[PDB]
Design an enzyme around this catalytic site. Structure first.
Site, PDB file in Angstrom:
ATOM      1  N   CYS A  29       0.900  -0.985   0.119  1.00  0.00           N
ATOM      2  CA  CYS A  29      -0.024   0.084  -0.071  1.00  0.00           C
ATOM      3  C   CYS A  29       0.900   1.171   0.066  1.00  0.00           C
ATOM      4  O   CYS A  29       0.519   2.492  -0.652  1.00  0.00           O
ATOM      5  CB  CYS A  29      -0.952  -0.038   1.143  1.00  0.00           C
ATOM      6  SG  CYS A  29      -0.145  -0.421   2.799  1.00  0.00           S
ATOM      7  N   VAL A  68      -0.005   4.046  -2.603  1.00  0.00           N
ATOM      8  CA  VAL A  68      -0.021   5.511  -2.272  1.00  0.00           C
ATOM      9  C   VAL A  68       0.790   6.481  -2.823  1.00  0.00           C
ATOM     10  O   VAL A  68       0.397   7.870  -3.365  1.00  0.00           O
ATOM     11  CB  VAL A  68      -0.564   5.580  -0.710  1.00  0.00           C
ATOM     12  CG1 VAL A  68      -0.376   7.155  -0.236  1.00  0.00           C
ATOM     13  CG2 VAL A  68      -1.584   4.673  -0.321  1.00  0.00           C
TER      14      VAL A  68
HETATM   15  S1  CLF Z   1       5.077  -2.308   6.921  1.00  0.00           S
HETATM   16 FE1  CLF Z   1       3.758  -2.707   8.719  1.00  0.00          FE
HETATM   17  S2  CLF Z   1       2.595  -4.562   8.200  1.00  0.00           S
HETATM   18 FE2  CLF Z   1       3.309  -3.523   5.947  1.00  0.00          FE
HETATM   19  S3  CLF Z   1       1.258  -2.336   5.220  1.00  0.00           S
HETATM   20 FE3  CLF Z   1       3.181  -1.201   6.491  1.00  0.00          FE
HETATM   21  S4  CLF Z   1       2.284  -0.850   8.707  1.00  0.00           S
HETATM   22 FE4  CLF Z   1       1.187  -2.780   7.667  1.00  0.00          FE
HETATM   23 FE5  CLF Z   1      -1.469  -4.699   5.974  1.00  0.00          FE
HETATM   24  S5  CLF Z   1      -2.564  -3.661   4.139  1.00  0.00           S
HETATM   25 FE6  CLF Z   1      -0.972  -5.216   3.075  1.00  0.00          FE
HETATM   26  S6  CLF Z   1       0.117  -5.820   5.157  1.00  0.00           S
HETATM   27 FE7  CLF Z   1       1.436  -4.146   4.267  1.00  0.00          FE
HETATM   28  S7  CLF Z   1       0.474  -4.297   1.942  1.00  0.00           S
HETATM   29 FE8  CLF Z   1      -0.874  -2.652   2.629  1.00  0.00          FE
END
Ligand code: CLF
Ligand code: ICS
Ligand code: CLF
Ligand SMILES: [Fe+3]
Ligand SMILES: [Fe+3]
EC number: 1.18.6.1
Lengths: 477, 522, 522, 477
Positions: free
Chosen positions: C152, C156
């Protein structure tokens, strides 16, 4: 219909047999005529089975141990002989009971003498006495011991009666020797007779001189109901709301005390005439207790039976019977309204042991279903006299039918539902015809009374209208 | 009373207040029931150690046995041959009971006939019964072979099967060329596995004894496989698949998996598949014979080594990891075929699951019962998993088998708490699990009652049952499973670890009481 | 205190009197806990219909979802190709979570890398991250192909994957001929199945879009099979076996079954099996392409129809009798191969099992959740068995899928009481099973908590859970099962019927209370 | 062992990397020298990972939500952002607690905003306020709300602090916004720091003016113990037997009231230095509360820690500590006498997060086991300063080790046991080497204290000596 076609089908099925087998089997297949009241001129029953024809009948040990003596819960029953007989008959019949198994109830347990070669050569009377001592040691709360004989017991010359007499005198216990060897008789009917004789000789008359039981004019006994899935309880509740007092219950959920107290009742209500007529007639002749049959299969039959029973008593019982009928009417009307559109017009073929092929007909008709064929394994000629008036014209009747005979009859008639035992269930399932187990109620029940009618209708609908019967032919075939 | 929208079966209809009141009235009025406190006291006494000494002193009374009689195994063996009718010389009640037992286990039609011997035959013998039964059976069901066993009736009256069949053929009741192998199966000797052995030996002797002049060992480049008494179709299937992967020619003798797994498509098949008469006649020409369950195939081993002159290998049942490896290497040595990479990968995958689940299996205590070969293979596999057998029961075992099992147990540090019982029934096992509580039981459906008794003592004393063996009546389609080979080992491992995890989940489902250990990841 | 002979883990060590006293002292001393009466009242309120009405009014809060994000499915798709390294452009925590999730479900190693994008890339981009990551991964782990998805953060910020990979190839970080397919997998769109579809479409476009000039449909006499998001190895195996029995040329695309079932033989295999690049390049030459799960393969279907000129058949998932029959007939029509007798016999055996278990399976009520194709296949199978689906939930389902499932339900009389929910989570389903109690639940391990809640209300209100779906964390080796074809139908039928029978056995184990219905034969 | 061989192995492992990656990774591998006190001269830690090298590190969201804030039971923790993060972090960590889940405890529950494309484009502050309203409606017994940010929250112009302030003022509820987005920092340690700062800013100072809590000279607070498998409980009972009063434990089985009451204690017993040193130092500067580290891994470390803690109090606490040690001596002595012969002389390598690689060495040495290699995912230089004196001569030290590096080191060294996470478990299990999970205790435990030492020894014996490790080679190869 088409009595001529039915007779032609009988002939075509019979062609395959050898001369003697064909001649014998010709007398056991018949076309119904309700105007005929003498089945002896029409069908022959209670005869020996032809060898090598895959019969369905059991043995006298099954009739005695598995049917009559087995449901008695406070007694320990010893299968005297090799290991197989008690192992194959252990917990195979769903005669329900209330008790603590292994302490004061022993119905689903398997007690056996475990005969070996030395027991065969040298006899098993000493082993039987030692076994009785060990039974008394390990199971103190048992209220009686019955010893059911198997084939080698009758073939080697064991005096079980003397052992039972000595051990009963020594331990002040009721020990009942039953000579129910499997080679005696041709089916379970002689087992029923022998078990009834044992009950009469050793158990029934134990309180002739006893008069400490308070008796009421509304005391009745239930005879021949073995509580298959709770059938006896479902009948007993209806009898109780009618104002009567059920003192004894033979033999499902039954106790030896109830059997001994039976000669004190005012009326016997015989469910299974075939297996208990001997003892009911003996009670009538000895103590003067009248006996009458009742049918609790489906709302119509149980209304008629309840009214017939209430007629045997004064006005209060009749008013209570009317009140019970009024109370239970809306429930079975709702059941009929729910399940008659889904079952109207279906044809049924039946093959059960000795009572249900003619009892369940009214229950089937109350759901708008017609019976086109029926048969018995071990019923006598009086059972066929009773059955022939309850069937439609030119319906099929078969006595001790073989696997091939029933196979071909079902193939030709093509019914919508078949009721028989476990040995025809999977065969008819692989044909694609819906099947209902009419001995164990397909592990369902009870089917007696108002409470059982709803279960019966639900089961009939769930089996007849199941989608799996429409999926037997692959779409590419 | 019944509601139309929710109809109640026997359970829980009789838990209603009116039925409960009726039952209480019946008990208080006419049953003369013992006081509840007395019943509780007697149950407590039956759960004690003194009751265990009194129970193990039994000499003449057998309570809840764990075995059947010989003609049942004879019928099962006869069912494994092509278009073969099992025919039991004796009383029809025995055949009815055999058919009911096998129908309840396999949930399939089972075909068997009897000559319906009665008091007349009890006095004069059953020669006429044999003649008419053979004629009627052949005329009605058109079998290619009739395999004849006996009940205790004919055994006691001492009927002569050979003379009876010879007279039947001589007088024209059945054709002389028609195959009628026979075996004497006294139910007061041994158990159903002994009957299987006797019937197989009778059939082999009938088809091979008189025609051994032109037989050469190893001429057809095949290996004979004798499975013995088996009630898992997956075992036959896995043996056939493993032999096919190795590229090994084989002849499976007494193969009933086709007739016990017929499809439902609108027609009835009395016969399906099975060992042909050509295979049985050509069996002496094989390189060797392998018996899958050697501890109840002793007569077969004697006949094969003596008559067929096959040097039968000393192989255990191919159950678990080590014994499956030994079986595969012995087959490879006999046939000269290398073990394929598919079997190596399957063994590695089984080892991988063992490594994954060793943490949950370690330290677990099991009771178990069944047939000798099945019990010893299960004991071996449980030892390989780090589990601890403590109560090992075999009603139809002998002293040599017990010595072999003790030798297996002594070779492992996990067998130090194990005791082997032969000639003991399930009442003895109930006493044992009460006095020395294990974690789980392994056995057939008859163990369910034992579990019930344990639950009566308390939830902390309940011993759950795992249904592996014969017969299983309260579950559907478990007869399709496998216990042999790597695949059978994987199935057993999955079942055991999942039973452990379901028990753990059930014990930790109490909210705010024990649910702190109700882990999502296990 | 501990006993060295019987060491207790957390359960039941923390049930000791000293630990209980310590916990009680802590709770009444420093936790300021609500009174137990208030907690009981609030729980009872949460089990009511008014609470359900409040709960279904939710529009911003999600409680206990039943779906994951796209890059997880992209990683699963990338794992299905030979010597292919999954590479996620973004943050490393996502890759750690993906690997932990798949490790817990499969109990197998899972390989995946990331460029470890930090706060610096939030303003400069991840171009240097991509260059260094591609070079390092190729140098260290030696993959034949690198399949790139996104997190994400990268979506973004707006990182151009195509430009980044082209610049990496141009500046010598990786060879120009090295295959690096890519896909954009935003986590705020769809779910994991959407990511699987995106990754597969990206790989297919990379390997086939620019070389369609020499492609002729039907040249290699094969049928392409796209399985979609699958977590049962048995499904891949059964599809391969069924297509092999028909004698049908086939090409399974994205087959991760070998890499998720590597043997434990003393070495670590990073790669095993998988679709080869030659197969993907030759895919446009197939007769046709079959999508096993068409409800999350819409982009793949669009690419295959518009570019490969393949007339993709309109087929449902091969789940249950009818859909398996339709799939087999469509394959036979496409390939011109008759359906073999073995598959007919297997279908008949499944019908036989249905006939045997119909009495126990009729009228049972099921709550159920999972992925759209799996959910609709299981609904179809339950309708075929006479069961009653009641609560059908799919968090990642859409309105067209809802209309299709409603059409399926309306065609059967057993779908009368069935309602379908899309966008709802497991708190919604907890409310539903409290207010309209079903007999059983079917779903992943996250349902276990719901079961606990029901047991808190009462034993008569408990809804047992049946673990079919993804992910399963509290049971071992369930990922080896099968849910497709006749084999999967038999496995599901056995599981359901034995769950029903085990529940009945538990409910009738009370001595002298309910054990009158504790039948040996069921 | 044989320092020159370890350096040679390091060089061969580095040989395969590209020049930049090799140069970076050369500074994260070392050969331990216990004489060296400052680790900055030998090892480098707390740096960004090299791209595409399969690190085991997590993110700041994992270190804040999954480690510090998640164990708080009476609070509801929202995962602000897309659905994946809370789904993967739900119930993956075994922080045990007591409570009614869904009513007054919410540890295993997953709360998220489930961001969509429209939320990305137009923000999620209004959605956050609506979600807070829904949480208040549906979970009335919650005692606080935490809002943990994921990557898009910090990437887009979301302002959760204003939303939290307004909603807290409106609902009179404590709402803690945590800017624990994933891309901040290099590992979970920055998540620890951010969570500690949020605790200090929003929760810790709530009862600064409240003086209604009765305080005793024996008030201690457990800091940095997260009750993995009950670990914190296994420690707390010991502290209770010493005569001390434990007012709070952070944060396993912890409550918001305990956090607010923490500034009232006399001592801060810090278990995990790495994750809670920030808050410990802040409380030391502000409230003047001293803090000391302790170690309850193994009998020796437990006894030394109990004595050190007792020395901080009066003589009565010291006497109680002596009584506790005397009472618990026979149990751990028996555990050693049973399990040390099975585990004597074995070699083990570990790879864990910030504290445990050096904390569990003493427990292994109590069983006669030698730690030959150790490493950290996200430790700082002070952690390595402690580790170097904790570890042995010529042993291997690794920081942010990669999968390739760990595999090559394990192949060359060939340890008897490996302790690491779930992402190396099956990798090393297929290799034929016993593996124990040192994060979740392989779903076993607890391992703290005297009662945990028995479980630890049993688990090590059961995994090291399992027969399955001798069956990995087929007999035909
Ligand atoms: S580094 Fe840490 S675990 Fe990674 S997103 Fe960022 S806070 Fe979360 Fe949840 S939704 Fe899936 S796992 Fe990521 S790609 Fe978008
Ligand atoms: S006793 Fe008889 S075969 Fe009358 S042996 Fe048989 S429980 Fe049948 S038709 Mo099983 S004469 Fe009872 C019977 Fe009828 S066992 Fe039951 S169902 S009413
Ligand atoms: S007709 Fe009836 S059931 Fe048959 S034996 Fe006779 S009493 Fe009994 Fe038990 S042991 Fe086996 S089955 Fe028989 S052959 Fe010896
Ligand atoms: Fe069947
Ligand atoms: Fe694995």
């Amino acid at each position: 219909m088409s009595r001529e076609e039915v007779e032609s089908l009988i002939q075509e099925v019979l062609e395959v047999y050898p001369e003697k087998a064909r001649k014998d089997r010709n007398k056991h297949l018949a076309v119904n005529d309700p105007a005929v009241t003498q089945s002896k001129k029409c069908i022959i029953s209670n005869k020996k089975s032809q060898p090598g024809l895959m019969t369905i009948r059991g043995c006298a040990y099954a009739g005695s141990k598995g049917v009559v003596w087995g449901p008695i819960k406070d007694m320990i029953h010893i299968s005297h002989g090799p290991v197989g007989c008690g192992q194959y008959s252990r917990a195979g019949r769903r005669n329900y009971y209330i008790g603590t198994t292994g302490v004061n109830a022993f119905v689903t347990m398997n007690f056996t003498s475990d005969f070996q070669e030395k027991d065969i050569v040298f006899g098993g009377d000493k082993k039987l006495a030692k076994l009785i001592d060990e039974v008394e040691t390990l199971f103190p709360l048992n209220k009686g011991i019955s010893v059911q004989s198997e084939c080698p017991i009758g073939l080697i010359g064991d005096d079980i009666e003397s052992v039972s007499k000595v051990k009963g005198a020594e331990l002040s216990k009721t020990i009942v020797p039953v000579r129910c060897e499997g080679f005696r008789g041709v089916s379970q009917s002689l087992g029923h007779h022998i078990a009834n004789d044992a009950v009469r000789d050793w158990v029934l008359g134990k309180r002739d001189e006893d008069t400490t039981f308070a008796s009421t004019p509304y005391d009745v006994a239930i005879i021949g109901d073995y509580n298959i899935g709770g059938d006896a309880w479902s009948s007993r509740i209806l009898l109780e709301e009618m104002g009567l007092r059920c003192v004894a219950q033979w033999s499902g959920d039954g106790s030896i005390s109830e059997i001994e107290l039976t000669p004190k009742v005012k009326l016997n209500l015989v469910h299974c005439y075939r297996s208990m007529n001997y003892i009911s007639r003996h009670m009538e002749e000895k103590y003067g207790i009248p006996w009458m049959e009742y049918n609790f299969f489906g709302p119509t039959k149980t209304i008629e039976s309840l009214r017939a029973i209430a007629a045997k008593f004064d006005e209060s019982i009749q008013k209570k019977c009317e009140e019970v009928i009024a109370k239970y009417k809306p429930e079975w009307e709702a059941v009929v309204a729910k399940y008659r559109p889904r079952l109207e017009g279906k044809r049924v073929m039946l093959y059960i042991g000795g009572l249900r092929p003619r009892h369940v007909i009214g229950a089937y008709e109350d759901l708008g279903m017609e019976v086109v064929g029926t048969g018995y394994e071990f019923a006598h000629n009086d059972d066929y006299d009773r059955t022939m008036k309850e069937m439609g014209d030119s319906t099929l009747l078969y006595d001790d039918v073989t696997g091939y005979e029933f196979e071909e009859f079902v193939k030709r008639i093509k019914p919508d539902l078949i009721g028989s035992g476990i040995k025809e269930k999977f065969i008819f399932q692989k044909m694609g015809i819906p099947f209902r187990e009419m001995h164990s109620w397909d592990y369902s029940g009870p089917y007696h009374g108002f409470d059982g009618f709803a279960i019966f209708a639900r089961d009939m609908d769930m089996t007849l209208n199941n989608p799996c019967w429409k999926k037997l032919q692959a779409p590419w075939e | 009373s019944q509601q139309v929208d929710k109809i109640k079966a026997s359970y829980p209809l009789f838990l209603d207040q009116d039925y409960k009141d009726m039952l209480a009235k019946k008990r208080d009025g006419f049953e003369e029931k013992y006081p509840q406190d007395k019943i509780d006291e007697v149950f407590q006494w039956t759960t004690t150690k003194e009751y265990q000494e009194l129970n193990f002193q039994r000499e003449a009374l057998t309570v809840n046995p764990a075995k059947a009689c010989q003609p049942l195994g004879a019928v099962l063996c006869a069912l494994g041959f092509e278009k073969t009718m099992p025919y039991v010389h004796g009383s029809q009640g025995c055949v009815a009971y055999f058919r009911s037992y096998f129908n309840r286990h396999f949930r399939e039609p089972v075909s068997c006939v009897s000559d319906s011997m009665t008091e007349d035959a009890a006095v004069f013998g059953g020669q006429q019964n044999m003649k008419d039964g053979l004629q009627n059976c052949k005329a009605t069901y058109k079998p290619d072979m009739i395999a004849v066993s006996t009940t205790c009736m004919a055994e006691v009256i001492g009927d002569d099967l050979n003379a009876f069949i010879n007279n039947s053929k001589k007088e024209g009741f059945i054709p002389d060329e028609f195959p009628v192998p026979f075996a004497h199966t006294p139910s007061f000797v041994g158990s159903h596995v002994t009957g299987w052995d006797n019937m197989f030996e009778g059939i082999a002797r009938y088809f091979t004894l008189k025609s051994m002049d032109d037989k050469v060992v190893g001429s057809n480049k095949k290996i004979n496989i004798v499975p013995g008494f088996e009630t898992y179709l997956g075992n036959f299937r896995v043996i056939k698949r493993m032999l096919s992967e190795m590229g090994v020619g084989y002849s499976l003798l007494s193969d009933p998996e086709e007739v016990l797994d017929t499809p439902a498509d609108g027609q009835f098949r009395m016969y399906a598949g099975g060992t042909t008469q050509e295979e049985m006649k050509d069996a002496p020409n094989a390189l060797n014979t392998v018996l899958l369950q050697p501890w109840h195939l002793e007569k077969t081993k004697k006949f094969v080594e003596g008559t067929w002159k096959h040097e039968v290998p000393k192989l255990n049942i191919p159950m678990g990891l080590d014994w499956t490896d030994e079986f595969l290497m012995k087959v490879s040595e006999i046939s000269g075929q290398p073990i394929p990479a598919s079997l190596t990968k399957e063994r590695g995958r089984l080892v991988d699951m063992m490594t994954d689940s060793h943490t949950w299996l370690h330290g677990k205590r099991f009771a178990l019962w069944g047939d000798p070969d099945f019990v010893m293979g299960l004991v071996k596999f449980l030892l390989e998993l780090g589990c601890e057998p403590v109560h090992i029961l075999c009603h139809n075992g002998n002293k040599r088998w017990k010595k072999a099992v003790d030798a297996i147990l002594a070779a492992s540090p996990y067998g130090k708490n194990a005791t082997v019982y032969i000639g003991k029934d399930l009442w003895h096992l109930r006493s044992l699990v009460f006095t020395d509580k294990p974690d789980f039981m392994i056995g057939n459906s008859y163990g369910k009652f034992i579990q019930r008794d344990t639950l009566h003592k308390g939830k902390e004393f309940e011993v759950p049952l795992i249904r592996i063996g014969f017969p299983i009546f309260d579950r559907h389609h478990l007869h399709r499973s496998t216990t042999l080979g790597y695949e059978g080992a994987m199935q057993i491992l999955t079942t055991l670890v999942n039973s452990i995890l379901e028990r753990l989940d059930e014990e930790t489902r109490g909210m705010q009481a024990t649910d702190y250990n109700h882990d999502l990841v296990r």
